[PDB]
Amino acid sequence: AMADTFLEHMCRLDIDDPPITARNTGIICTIGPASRSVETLKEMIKSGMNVARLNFSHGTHEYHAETIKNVRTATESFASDPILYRPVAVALDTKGPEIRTGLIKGSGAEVELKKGATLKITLDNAYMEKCDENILWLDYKNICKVVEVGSKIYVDDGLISLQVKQKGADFLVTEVENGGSLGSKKGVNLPGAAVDLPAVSEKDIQDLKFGVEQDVDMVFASFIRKASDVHEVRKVLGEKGKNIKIISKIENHEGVRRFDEILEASDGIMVARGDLGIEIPAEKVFLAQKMMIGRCNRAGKPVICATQMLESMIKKPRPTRAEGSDVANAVLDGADCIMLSGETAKGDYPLEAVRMQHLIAREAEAAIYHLQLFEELRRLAPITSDPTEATAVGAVEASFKCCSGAIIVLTKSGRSAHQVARYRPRAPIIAVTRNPQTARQAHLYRGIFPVLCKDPVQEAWAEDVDLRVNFAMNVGKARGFFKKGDVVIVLTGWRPGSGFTNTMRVVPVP
Amino acid sequence: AMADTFLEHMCRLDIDDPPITARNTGIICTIGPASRSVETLKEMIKSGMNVARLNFSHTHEYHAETIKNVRTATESFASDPILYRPVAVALDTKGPEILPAVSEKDIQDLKFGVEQDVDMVFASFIRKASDVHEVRKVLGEKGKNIKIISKIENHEGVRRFDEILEASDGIMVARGDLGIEIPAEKVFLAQKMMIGRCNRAGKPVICATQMLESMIKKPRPTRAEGSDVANAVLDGADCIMLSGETAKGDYPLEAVRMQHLIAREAEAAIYHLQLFEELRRLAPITSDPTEATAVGAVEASFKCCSGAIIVLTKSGRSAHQVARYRPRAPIIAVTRNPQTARQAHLYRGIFPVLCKDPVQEAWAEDVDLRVNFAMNVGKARGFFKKGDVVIVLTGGFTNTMRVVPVP
Amino acid sequence: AMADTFLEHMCRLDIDDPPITARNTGIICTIGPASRSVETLKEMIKSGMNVARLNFSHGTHEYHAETIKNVRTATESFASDPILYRPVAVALDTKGPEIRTGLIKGSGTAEVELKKGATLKITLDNAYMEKCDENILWLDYKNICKVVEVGSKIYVDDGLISLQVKQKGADFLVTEVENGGSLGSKKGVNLPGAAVDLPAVSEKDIQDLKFGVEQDVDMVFASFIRKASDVHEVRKVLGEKGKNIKIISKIENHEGVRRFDEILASDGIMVARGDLGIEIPAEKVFLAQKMMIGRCNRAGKPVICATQMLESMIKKPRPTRAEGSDVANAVLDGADCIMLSGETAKGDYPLEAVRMQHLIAREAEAAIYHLQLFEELRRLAPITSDPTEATAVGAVEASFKCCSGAIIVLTKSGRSAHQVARYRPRAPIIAVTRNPQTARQAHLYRGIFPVLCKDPVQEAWAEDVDLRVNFAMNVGKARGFFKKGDVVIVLTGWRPGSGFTNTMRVVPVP
Amino acid sequence: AMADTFLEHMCRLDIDDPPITARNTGIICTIGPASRSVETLKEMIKSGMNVARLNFSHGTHEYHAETIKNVRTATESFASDPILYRPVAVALDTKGPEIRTGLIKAEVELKKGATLKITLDNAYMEKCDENILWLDYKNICKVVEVGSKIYVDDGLISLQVKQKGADFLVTEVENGGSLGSKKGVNLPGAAVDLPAVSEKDIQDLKFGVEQDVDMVFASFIRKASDVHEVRKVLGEKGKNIKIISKIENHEGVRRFDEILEASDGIMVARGDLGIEIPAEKVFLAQKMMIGRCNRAGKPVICATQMLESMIKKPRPTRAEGSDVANAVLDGADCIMLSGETAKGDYPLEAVRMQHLIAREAEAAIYHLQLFEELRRLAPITSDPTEATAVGAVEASFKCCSGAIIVLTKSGRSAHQVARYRPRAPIIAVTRNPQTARQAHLYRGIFPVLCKDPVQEAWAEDVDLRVNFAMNVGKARGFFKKGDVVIVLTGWRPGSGFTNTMRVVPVP
């Protein structure tokens, strides 16, 4: 990042200059049958998984309870050594207002819709398991009240398109535009219709209540379109779930247009590109992506790039060039986390997909033009009387000045570490906490390596601080972030409890 | 653009702001069984193909007929020079495919390329300067004006890159073998490095391979594919390429249309305020009047938000010089040399137009007729409309810039 | 300007690097008894004078008519060679609302000495108008009793003597000497904290401005402008006959600085530091200077830095270090012209003062950080449909790209040359005009070398353009600006008359 | 510094926007007949003097010893009270290789075109007149030639060498005027061979060590060894004495970098400099040196004729007010008064004016660009103190703190903060008296001498000094209770470096 121009910075990128050990971008993995086993989850963790996502679009509460137990069992298998122990977060991703088709008729396995053929859509439950090439059932009872003749209707990842020609009280007559093979229970998208399904349905409420009961760390709330949607999710989690982070998934045109009010009410954002690239033209997704990462970076709030990042690894052991590009560019954009969906839930190469993201994220982070980034984050940040905030930016500046091996942060809520991550140091942030939930939610922020201290509280505040600082030193040495010869930054408070971070030291590693 | 910072530039990206109708990034399509027919080539031109790529990695009689179908489809529109879109022809070698810098079979394809009047050659597995020299020595004096584009597909070619760029007319980032030759996670570094240096030197760079891979079988690309095309344009790739997507896949027209749509949206999103500043800062003081005029016109086009920069040019050089400075505005290059007009597609933002009118005896009348030709092109293609402001560059050098209304 | 930061640009300044032949900053010389002879004026033109300033605070119309005649006689003594002819402007500087004391007592020493704490009576009684002394002081502001308040401070003689008002009275005020010193005759009086009710444009000023129109002056330096309406009264007086006379508003009090934006209504600005640093605290003047120069640069309007720039050269043949610095820094600030007053009107070394301002201006111009200045003037200037503006910025960019020997501009009103100067090329701007007044007014703009083409109008437009272009080419070679085989930028229009500059050429010097 | 461009920053300058209280730029006053008495020296400290300059071109050790004693008397008159106590440094300005004429016949007028013989025969040494001038440069005839120009009395009088002899040269008056006694002589272009460190210099320099001076201003430094010579004479007894090389000739400018590398600081000595090189080039030399000294983190002083007209007048010229402002905008750590305070009629007015202008200028600095460029030009470090300092200045802007409080023994740590040019004042708490006086060489360092005894428990002693700074800042109107300030201390006792930054409210 020594070059005086971004262009010169590009020219100096060198594929033979190896990156640093520490990978800063968090990796979110969707758990499914391919990755649900305790054995596999241990290897997922080893490979670099930081957050387990449980897609409540499918599966019972008993099923997800079991996955959650396997995740925690895999995770606590490493707990015997707190110096190498890596916290793993659990994320609930709601179903939300999904539209799906019914089952293909048992006669059949899948029907071919061919270009220009007619297809009837009905809401008569007699066909809900008898779908075929002439009659398609779906589960949105009021689909007729929201579409008109000429409307487009999209089916199965937007790969099949239908145009309404007749619009009836019970039925719709459609003309197959782009045809293909149609299976069972495929997603339906109605872009540019005013879909009246609730943001938080009754299933979502029970799912969210269940989330609080199983002590999940965060919620990925589907199809958020306005701030009041976020507030309903918040109300459901209630007082008991007040510490669970709400990550609004931006997946439709309205979500993008009202992004600022959604951002202000949310704890973070996911750029949910799968649905988003069907609700809005596929050529516009990258615009929406870079806008949202930029604004979250500017707000200091976590943002997740999601969906089809390594899609071909569902079936192949190495990704496409486009897919390698896309993961790098999400990190360069400024994403706090990258995510995997089918690639880990259902694919033939779950571990290969995690490892590839780990490799690309680390190459991309060394390619960041920190000179310009740190300069602009500072220019867009407000002036304030916050001791923690002035301490965090001081520490980041100092970390650049001595190319520190890490920035060590004692934090109870995680906030002090979040305030450091918002200014994007090159150096990893080792966040020492005794709060296990804090160590799991730390993964939402770029660069925070959360380590969980289980030593007793020391009576003398000074001795307690030194204990946790020394703990971070050993973690740093053990994982190879620095050695005894190096300099590190250390952020500590003047008294116990949240809100008291006001001290930055520059210390040689002992 | 405007915002004082790149970060605020990003925050202001607006999905509902439609882009200017002119698409600056060239689209290179590999022709194969899915695309070799005259009827679909006509539709590939209409959907936005600018360069037909012919992969000699697989008989000369087969390629001669594909080449004939391309020219047939191309001149199918020649009835009208105001709407005629030139299409170039590219020969891609096999190289060492399972070693000789240039093969014996490559020497036969290259010589076959000259006889077929190909506009450019994509040279596979270029590893050093001497490798290009062997290709240009084989192209000889007949293919003197064939543009040579070294494909960087190997570690050494990356390692010896500066050599190769100097010895070449352009570069292709050939990621499919590059991604097996070097670790896949390092390819974005090589891609962005090479595009940066090509942008710095004013030499064309193609970003190639797997950009819309999943459209070989599907009618819509993945989210990562859409991102890859956009980011290649934001890197500065003069052209983006399709290989299997148009050569053999089930949706060749769909692949072309999508690269057109994405490239256009990405061009709208380029942070011109910074890019123009850095290209200028990084480019040397010159005594060449055409170079001084070129950056003067680009600066003028930003100041007045010109509908276009019209460049009268014969060898294309004058127009290339404008394009390296990356105006937002389309560069309408007017030329009588058909090969110049075909080859222009290798430079971002050059919309070539071929004048078929006879020379007027008076140089002034001749200049004005060609300029009026560009005016009609831009009115018809919707680049600008009557009463808009445009930039006109005319002449042994294009040294004169005029700021004129659109009549 | 090749360094990537301003700090590194300073570090690279080099006293052994000689500067380009052409000096861009105009030099305005106040004409008085030291300088009003035809022979001395000739040497002042050879020494670098571009504008003759006539201070109508003193002298009769007959006196000033003679000066003006002598200026034109010396200027036209060079007219036989149009290649070398330097146009020379004439400026009328108004008296404005001046307050002066009377004449000292004849019997006492030419100067009476006032001592700290003494009493001094100020009177309007005309029997004392030529009998001022250390006890009683006449002055010519008949209304000063109405607008001065007890406790307010009165300043006399370039703000060197200060008085504190003690008692008000009928046709008098009783004051106590705060800062003493020697007091002479007809010294200027400042009342910084009064609502001085003298007319913005007095009857004397109206007579003087009509006489300026009669004498064909090029510009008016309007004294003590406080508001836009003041400028409009000056412009009404000049009327239709003087409609082409440039009005330069002198900013010399607090209200003028306060209402600067509305005043800048004007064609240009003078920073009149003499009265300014008495009307406001002297430590604050450089703030006012840098503010006004910056806003005039951003507006594209001429700004003059004036007064005491080389004051010690009134009596000494070389200046103080502070004076060398002030001139250089006025040019680095962005000032279009620098000015001399007593140094050329009444001092012992008028010629040496002109040559020093020439020497310093030239060195400072090579020290401007053009890389930053061009970038910022562009960024702050509006987008435009104007073909001439787009052509001008394009010429300045091209002139930087080929390090051109000059930008040749054909112009009738001046404005095409003005529009180029606004973006501050390093290269000189040779403005070829047939309009003598345009040639004289061009000196108000940084970097414009005006040349007056005497050749008859050629029948065809293209022929006529090529003549004037070749005239500019011969001017540049004869004056040492460029030589054959160098490259220059040439700006010409598509049609005779003002407003049609569109055309920019990069052409070798034949 | 909130404007996106320097141009917009200029346009937003506002004369009705009052400055902050603390003045960051140091003021160096030449003490002489006008300013020697204990009474006015006191009023000079109250008016803003920080460094007392003693010019050993003139005067005897005894005279200067009495000057030094009157400086220490006024300064300690305030010592009763360490909260308000302002330390005052003492600087010794060497004579150097000065060429001076003899005693006339007491002035003598001289006219252009006339002849003037200059002799080295020490007989006419006290019989100088319109026909024969005597000067003390014994090799002058070796180092000038027929056609050379010679300047006398601050470059006002000029002569041209028409005939050369053994002990003489025959010259024609180029610019005349009232010649006088013992005036100064310059030979621009003449390769003068006089020694950099003279015999009298060694005596004067040894005299400075015994008088406990804080810094030497070494005249006419031409090369690195010259600084090495001044340093060797100061020896181990005076190893803690800062050597400021005075740049006042063409070779000093050409050889500036190696002189900077060898010195503790630089003075831009514009008087001789603007005679040795063309006056229109002085501003380039001044901006070059202040920039390179800013880059390197070493103090730089802008001196000579900043307020020259105030020697006789109570108000300065517009050019002088602008010169002081622009020196501060250039980057200078201190500005200087010479004749204005040593012999003139208004030395308290001059000190006060330099205080007033410097304050308004520091308020006008475009910190946004300045801080960004100082970092980009400063190298990556492994020193904890250095990274802590830049981190503290970054924190400074982030919370716009009242001050950066630095505990420091040698001063170093406060110097490392200062080089990054924070807007907030740096209150450097020290128990070392020499450290507290020398700190004035560095822009922004408001030094305070803690006199309370050491406390046994280190963290008790640290807090003692910290709360001293708090009272200091609250009393001098820098901040008020509740304001945020930055505090730089050590971490572990005896660590030797200042690697701890805390963001605390003022108690």
Ligand SMILES: O=C([O-])C(=O)[O-]
């Ligand atoms: O729900 C999602 O994550 C999506 O659509 O990408």
Ligand SMILES: O=C([O-])C(=O)[O-]
């Ligand atoms: O050969 C190629 O084009 C490649 O590997 O990308």
Ligand SMILES: O=C([O-])C(=O)[O-]
């Ligand atoms: O009138 C003036 O020129 C002044 O006050 O400086």
Ligand SMILES: O=C([O-])C(=O)[O-]
């Ligand atoms: O010695 C000095 O101070 C000078 O020459 O300016």
Ligand SMILES: [K+]
């Ligand atoms: K879901």
Ligand SMILES: [K+]
């Ligand atoms: K999934």
Ligand SMILES: [K+]
């Ligand atoms: K006046």
Ligand SMILES: [K+]
């Ligand atoms: K001296």
Ligand SMILES: [Mg+2]
């Ligand atoms: Mg979705």
Ligand SMILES: [Mg+2]
């Ligand atoms: Mg005035």
Ligand SMILES: [Mg+2]
């Ligand atoms: Mg000296």
